[PDB]
């Protein structure tokens, strides 16, 4: 007699992980970037760059 074409089956599980990193900003160099108080010459200065 002939043979029937078998086929398989499997169930795989997702194994979960996570990686994380971080940095930090100084309080001194904080107000130099965001704050819109710097009017005329402190927007294009060397310290802000």
């Amino acid at each position: 007699p002939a043979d029937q074409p078998v086929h398989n089956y499997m169930i795989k599980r997702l194994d979960r992980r996570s990686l994380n990193a971080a940095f930090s900003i100084a309080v001194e160099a904080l107000g130099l970037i965001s704050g819109e108080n710097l009017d005329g010459t402190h927007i294009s200065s060397a310290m802000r760059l």
Binding site: T41, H42, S45, A46, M47
Partner: peptide
């Protein structure tokens, strides 16, 4: 006034005096 190395070569208050 913050400059780079670029170069060229009232009111009436009450007080005692």
């Amino acid at each position: 006034v913050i400059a780079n190395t670029n170069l060229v070569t009232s009111a009436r208050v009450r007080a005692d005096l």
